[PDB]
Amino acid sequence: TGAGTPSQGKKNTTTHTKCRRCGEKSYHTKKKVCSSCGFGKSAKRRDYEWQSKAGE
Amino acid sequence: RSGRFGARYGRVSRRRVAEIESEMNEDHACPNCGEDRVDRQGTGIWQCSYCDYKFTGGSYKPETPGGKTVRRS
Amino acid sequence: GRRIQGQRRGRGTSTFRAPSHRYKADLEHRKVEDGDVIAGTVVDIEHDPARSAPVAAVEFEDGDRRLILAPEGVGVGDELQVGVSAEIAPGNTLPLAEIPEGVPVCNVESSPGDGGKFARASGVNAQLLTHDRNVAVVKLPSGEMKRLDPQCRATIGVVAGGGRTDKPFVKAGNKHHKMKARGTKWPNVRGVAMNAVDHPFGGGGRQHPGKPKSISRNAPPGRKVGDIASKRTGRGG
RNA sequence: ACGACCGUAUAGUACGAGAGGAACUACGGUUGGUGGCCACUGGUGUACCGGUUGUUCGAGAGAGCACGUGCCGGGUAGCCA
RNA sequence: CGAGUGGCUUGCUACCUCGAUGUCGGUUCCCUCCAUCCUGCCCGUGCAGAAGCGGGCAAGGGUGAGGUUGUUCGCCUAUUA
RNA sequence: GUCGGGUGAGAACCCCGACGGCCUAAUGGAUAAGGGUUCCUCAGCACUGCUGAUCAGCUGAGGGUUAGCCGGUCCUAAGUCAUACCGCAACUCGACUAUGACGAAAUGGGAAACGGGUUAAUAUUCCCGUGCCACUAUGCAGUGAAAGUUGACGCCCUGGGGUCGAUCACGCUGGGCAUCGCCCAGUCGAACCGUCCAACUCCGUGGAAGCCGUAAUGGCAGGAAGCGGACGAACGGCGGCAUAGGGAAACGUGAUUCAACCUGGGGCCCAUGAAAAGACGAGCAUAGUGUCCGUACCGAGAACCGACACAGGUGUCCAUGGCGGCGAAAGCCAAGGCCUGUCGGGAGCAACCAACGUUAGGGAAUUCGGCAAGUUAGUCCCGUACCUUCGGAAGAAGGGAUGCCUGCUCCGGAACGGAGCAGGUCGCAGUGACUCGGAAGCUCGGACUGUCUAGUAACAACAUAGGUGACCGCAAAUCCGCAAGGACUCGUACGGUCACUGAAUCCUGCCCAGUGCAGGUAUCUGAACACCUCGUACAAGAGGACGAAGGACCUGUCAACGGCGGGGGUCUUAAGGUAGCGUAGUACCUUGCCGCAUCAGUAGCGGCUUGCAUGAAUGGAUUAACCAGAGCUUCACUGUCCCAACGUUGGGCCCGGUGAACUGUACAUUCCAGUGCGGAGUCUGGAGACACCCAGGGGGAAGCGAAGACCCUAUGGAGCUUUACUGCAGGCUGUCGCUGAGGACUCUCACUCCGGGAGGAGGACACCGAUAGCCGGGCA
RNA sequence: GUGGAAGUCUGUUAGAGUUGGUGUCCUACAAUACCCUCUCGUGAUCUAUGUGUAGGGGUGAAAGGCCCAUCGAGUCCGGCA
Ligand SMILES: [Cl-]
Ligand SMILES: [Cl-]
Ligand SMILES: [Cl-]
Ligand SMILES: [K+]
Ligand SMILES: [Mg+2]
Ligand SMILES: [Mg+2]
Ligand SMILES: [Mg+2]
Ligand SMILES: [Mg+2]
Ligand SMILES: [Mg+2]
Ligand SMILES: [Mg+2]
Ligand SMILES: [Mg+2]
Ligand SMILES: [Mg+2]
Ligand SMILES: [Mg+2]
Ligand SMILES: [Mg+2]
Ligand SMILES: [Mg+2]
Ligand SMILES: [Mg+2]
Ligand SMILES: [Mg+2]
Ligand SMILES: [Mg+2]
Ligand SMILES: [Mg+2]
Ligand SMILES: [Mg+2]
Ligand SMILES: [Mg+2]
Ligand SMILES: [Mg+2]
Ligand SMILES: [Mg+2]
Ligand SMILES: [Mg+2]
Ligand SMILES: [Mg+2]
Ligand SMILES: [Mg+2]
Ligand SMILES: [Mg+2]
Ligand SMILES: [Mg+2]
Ligand SMILES: [Mg+2]
Ligand SMILES: [Mg+2]
Ligand SMILES: [Mg+2]
Ligand SMILES: [Mg+2]
Ligand SMILES: [Mg+2]
Ligand SMILES: [Mg+2]
Ligand SMILES: [Mg+2]
Ligand SMILES: [Mg+2]
Ligand SMILES: [Mg+2]
Ligand SMILES: [Mg+2]
Ligand SMILES: [Mg+2]
Ligand SMILES: [Mg+2]
Ligand SMILES: [Mg+2]
Ligand SMILES: [Mg+2]
Ligand SMILES: [Mg+2]
Ligand SMILES: [Mg+2]
Ligand SMILES: [Mg+2]
Ligand SMILES: [Mg+2]
Ligand SMILES: [Mg+2]
Ligand SMILES: [Mg+2]
Ligand SMILES: [Mg+2]
Ligand SMILES: [Mg+2]
Ligand code: NA
Ligand code: NA
Ligand code: NA
Ligand code: NA
Ligand code: NA
Ligand code: NA
Ligand code: NA
Ligand code: NA
Ligand code: NA
Ligand code: NA
Ligand code: NA
Ligand code: NA
Ligand code: NA
Ligand code: NA
Ligand code: NA
Ligand code: NA
Ligand code: NA
Ligand code: NA
Ligand code: NA
Ligand code: NA
């Protein structure tokens, strides 16, 4: 079976959804963890220095 | 017996399956009463259709050479 | 290279775990305050999914209902006893001290009260040879002479289901069904049939181990494969 | 846009001890190539006509579908070898 | 032993292309060369004849079918001018 | 699709009718996920729609989803999270152990709903009628009340009960047809309340010594049949519900086969087939309460995923519509749906191309190869070789039969079930279409079913049962983690880990020198601490004594890595190739030699065989069965070929509409030669050449497409290997700390493990922290 | 005779798979498609949903296969000009 188009047909599973805490469609309803803000994993807000250039 | 295996598996394998199952399917003398009505119910489990006595034995024989020794000593 | 299969095992992932939730009971000798008065009646005989051997359901006097490691020759209706003064008949459990030398025994404790550790598989048995006030010498199924505290409890008789190993599996499918009830990854791909990256015996233009198969005791995991600290190999001599 | 071969008469002759065995010329045919043609033979011919299976239109009659004819038998013109 | 011609083989060289000139063999379809295998016209013969052998002119036409092998090549079979 | 017609400024494709078609596990009906308003109405055509559009899933505006009894909700599953505890430098990190919570919308468990009616759009939700469940309150009954039952369960075979459907018979109602007398539709009516009860189990009677019974197994003096009785089923029968409802009308009765549903019997397991909430147990009247969330629509060749109105992908139920037949098969046809797998008009419609039909005579000559195509075919009877693991081979092969019509026989309770007989009779052909094997032999490989390179490899590769070796007594072996801890393990040697070989059958020789592993070890070597000597008012430092693991040394071991020659009638380096097999899928010479077979056979098979460079679990030989595996032979077959022809359908060609891309330094009508960085449309010399346009097959533009995969170069990269260099985990071992009392020893008090506790085992060891030596491609 | 076993046979039942055609397509209907052919189809079977394992790590009947068109070490951003 082709890994491309033919394998795209079984994709009717809901995972990432609108997050209660940040509003982004990143709350993974299976993991109950937001990949954008960290809700469900961290009380503190998800954030990293690599999200911007080193000297900025 | 091993006739269900057709021309598959070779001699030894089906010769022993037939031999083992042959003895397994023989009439067995119930330990409780003395009637020849003991049948295998599963792995190591034996039961008398006559009086219902359900007991432990070998996997394919109701009695094993080791179990017989116990009685003695 | 990559971690070898033996290393994937230790992580305890689903593929390597035993289907514990599907198991029936953790066979262990009952605890008795003392006196031995404890007796019960066999209510049924069941199949043990973790041992491919029968096991017995027992209702004890004080209301307790527990499955028991069943020796051969135990049936519904039988009365089993557990204690120092237990009669000396198959199916009963008592300390090696109260047991007459020369009698076959199973489910032997390693340390008094641990509930039983030795001789528990199909049709096997230990052999109580010597007694003493200090040591009870038992011969385990492997043939080893084991010195045990005479206070170690044991069950009279040989384990039920003897002879299971006498029948060949004949087909892959039968192994399959058994393996599904154990904590094991099956089937088994030979190391020499793998790539170098996956196993120390992997690689090559044809199949053969790269070095000799006997590996040192000190070899690290990932390398300890083949014949581990073999004192010898082959059949000759 | 014609190439080449076989056969007959020449002749059982010339030549030759014999065995064997030509030619010029005149004929008939074959093969390969070439161009055209369909009276003849052959192919096709889901034009056409008949037989017949299953099913549907109640039967009969007469029909549809079965891959672009259901299958089978015959086959005009034309096109062809 | 000596002097050459060809550019089909092999070797040599490293000029051309590494921001790619698609491989071998086969096939199909077209043109050509002559160092001519057959055919035409000839010369010599250890040319009686018949069948040959060798040579000259000559490239109009022909040079086919098969068995093994991917084979080119080559071996083999029956036809063939 | 076509002919008429409707609307409209405008109609091939928007709507009506007729005629003609397409879809039958779907192109129909109901839905899960997912989409998210796509649903309905009105108004529109700038956008989207493969052409057009008055149409629309498009644009704009409004409207639309109603629940005690359908789902959610509640329960618990694999498993997940939170808190506590502990770890970690630390945490948003981490395993265990507690507690708590989460975790199933078709498709797990589960209190309770049916029928009719209604809207443009909802509907077990609204309306009408009827029924039912739970909780609470009141009243009567009741003292019972928690034991038990249920929820609640695998795979295979099978009996009985039985509804719908389908079919048959006959009657009634309506319709169709018009030579007969046939053909079609209907003939209805729920939940619920009540009642009936087969099977299983049991009781009494009875008293079988051979009877009883089954599809089959089976049953019995431990009490068979018969007889009587207890318990006891359907989504089933029956009565009510119902001068409810529905129907234009009639508003049936019997039967067979019987999905659903109910209830039994048998067989299998080195496999044992959830749990919890809840229900029952545990009566009745009346009344009150029953909130919250979901509900439109699509569910796909246009509403989902695939950038698209994408020929792909995507779960469940309807598996009982008719004929057909073994059939959920084909073909044909209902119900229901559709003409939207959405551009049309024209030319006998040429060449050429895609699918395909038929081709005389020959019959594999084609070709790497029978690739492609063809042949055969269903069912019954007869008959069936080598070989074989006795199963098989086998549908071997081969031979015969096959329709219709008339009258019958047999099996069975019967079928609208099956098996036969006699007679008549038509065709070229009776499995008449459809459905539907070509067959046989030799050799190689792997035993077999199975697995695999999603996207050029399905194989001989992997797996497998079987054979074998290794480690380990469980405070284990093996493995994961930095740690806290963890998998194996609800396990315990008939175990489970680590490897090799790869069914069966006959077998599996010789070698321990090297390497590996393991055991032993007088002596030799072997680190650090402590100790002794020298040195230093101390220290650095030098040396000694002691000596662990390890090494030297010795031994064991090849189903451990591997080896099995040259020379002579021993030498390297341990042995010197045994049974077998052999020009091999291993043989350079090589198309080896002989034979078979063919006109001819580098092929194939057999024999020989000095084997460039066969050989025994790096398994050897051999082998029935199996195989989309490799090679070869025969019969049959045939357009593969001789050698091509004609035809069919869709294109191609012309016309309306829609409308890209690739590619482009410039110039460019070229051809023959030459030259040039040696492969020129453009330079040089000649030749030819009036321009534009249509169709064609692709000779050239070293045509387009891709900064060559080959090769080399770079003090480039990466994956992999090892007795490369250097290090790092990990294992072993000495030492110090924890650590205590009296080169060998006892004890108990730390510490560790077993025990519910009492206590037991072990014990200054082990664990842990630190350090030293050895091993150490496991890793960088 | 009964019985009805089997990693058993035939089989486009459903469903799974993917051998040949080196066909059609190859600016595709499609960044793995279409048709015919072909294999399996009671079991080591196929499948929905839920759920676990994560990057030198998983998973792997082992092909360096697979881990969202990405694999001899995923993807994203950062180190980084
Ligand atoms: Cl096992
Ligand atoms: Cl719902
Ligand atoms: Cl029955
Ligand atoms: K090049
Ligand atoms: Mg991928
Ligand atoms: Mg346990
Ligand atoms: Mg498992
Ligand atoms: Mg294996
Ligand atoms: Mg490999
Ligand atoms: Mg390695
Ligand atoms: Mg091998
Ligand atoms: Mg090997
Ligand atoms: Mg037709
Ligand atoms: Mg080119
Ligand atoms: Mg000349
Ligand atoms: Mg010429
Ligand atoms: Mg609409
Ligand atoms: Mg409108
Ligand atoms: Mg919940
Ligand atoms: Mg449910
Ligand atoms: Mg609706
Ligand atoms: Mg709806
Ligand atoms: Mg469409
Ligand atoms: Mg012909
Ligand atoms: Mg040939
Ligand atoms: Mg040829
Ligand atoms: Mg073929
Ligand atoms: Mg009868
Ligand atoms: Mg036919
Ligand atoms: Mg060969
Ligand atoms: Mg195989
Ligand atoms: Mg592939
Ligand atoms: Mg295959
Ligand atoms: Mg393939
Ligand atoms: Mg193999
Ligand atoms: Mg094995
Ligand atoms: Mg074994
Ligand atoms: Mg084994
Ligand atoms: Mg030979
Ligand atoms: Mg050997
Ligand atoms: Mg010029
Ligand atoms: Mg380059
Ligand atoms: Mg290279
Ligand atoms: Mg490198
Ligand atoms: Mg403990
Ligand atoms: Mg390295
Ligand atoms: Mg099968
Ligand atoms: Mg099949
Ligand atoms: Mg899943
Ligand atoms: Mg490889
Ligand atoms: Na290897
Ligand atoms: Na170039
Ligand atoms: Na060529
Ligand atoms: Na010539
Ligand atoms: Na040849
Ligand atoms: Na249209
Ligand atoms: Na009833
Ligand atoms: Na039918
Ligand atoms: Na199979
Ligand atoms: Na050795
Ligand atoms: Na050795
Ligand atoms: Na060898
Ligand atoms: Na197969
Ligand atoms: Na043809
Ligand atoms: Na061209
Ligand atoms: Na690499
Ligand atoms: Na029989
Ligand atoms: Na295919
Ligand atoms: Na990585
Ligand atoms: Na960067």
**Ligand 63 center–CA B53 separation, angstroms:** 48
- Does residue C109 contact residue C93 with C-beta atoms inside 8 Å? no
HEC profile for B30-62? CCCCCCCCEEEEECCEEEECCCCCEEECCCCCC
- Does residue C19 contact residue C180 with C-beta atoms inside 8 Å? yes
Q: Which residue has the tokens 């005479």?
A: C150
- C102 and C137 in one domain? yes
Strand, coil or helix: B66: helix
How near does any CA of chain B get to the CA of C130, in Å?
Answer: 15
Nearest nucleotide, C1' to the C-alpha of C191?
Answer: F499
Q: Which residue has the tokens 């995972």?
A: A15
With residue C94 as reference, give the H or E element that holds it.
Answer: strand C93-95
**Sequence letter at residue C64:** D
User: Chain B within 8 Å of C191 (Cβ-Cβ)?
Assistant: no
- Does residue C81 contact residue C36 with C-beta atoms inside 8 Å? yes
Q: What are phi and psi of C215, to 5 degrees?
A: -105, 145
Q: Any idea of the CA torsion for C181, B41, C104, C98, to the nearest 10 degrees?
A: 100
- C142 and C177 in one domain? no
- C177 and C135 in one domain? no
Task: Give dist(CA B36, CA B49) in Å, integer.
Answer: 9
Nearest nucleotide, C1' to the C-alpha of C15?
Answer: G53
Task: Give dist(CA B32, CA C74) in Å, integer.
Answer: 11
Total Cβ atoms within 10 A of residue C166:
15
Q: Please answer yes or no on whether B56 and C123 come within 8 Å at the CB atom.
A: no
Strand G nucleotides with an atom less than 7 Å from a protein beta carbon:
5-8, 17-18, 30-33, 43-45, 48-53, 56-64, 66-70, 72-73, 77-81
Domain with C72 in it: 1-78
- C104 and C155 in one domain? yes
Q: Could you say which of C78, C108, C128 is where a domain stops?
A: C78
The number of domains in chain C is 3
**Residue C52: both structure tokens together:** 């491919």
**Residue A45: both structure tokens together:** 């807000």
| CATH of A1-56 given 1.10.3210.10, 3.30.830.10, 3.10.105.10, 2.20.25.30 | 2.20.25.30
Task: Give dist(CA C93, CA C28) in Å, integer.
Answer: 11
CB environment C13-33: b (16+ within 10 A), e (fewer): eeeeeeeeeeeeeebbbbebe
- Does residue B14 contact residue C166 with C-beta atoms inside 8 Å? no
- Every domain of chain B and the residues it spans: 1-73
Task: Give dist(CA C71, CA C152) in Å, integer.
Answer: 18
CATH number at residue C17: 2.40.50.140
CATH number at residue C116: 2.30.30.30
Please tell me the CATH code under which domain B1-73 is placed: 2.20.25.30
Q: Could you say which of C98, C127, C159 is where a domain stops?
A: C159
Q: Any idea of the CA torsion for C15, C68, C35, B69, to the nearest 10 degrees?
A: -120
CA distances from C194 to B39, C74, C83, C227 (A): 48, 49, 55, 18
CA of A12 to C1' of G34 (A): 27
Among C40, C108, C36, which residue's Cα sits nearest to residue C69? C108
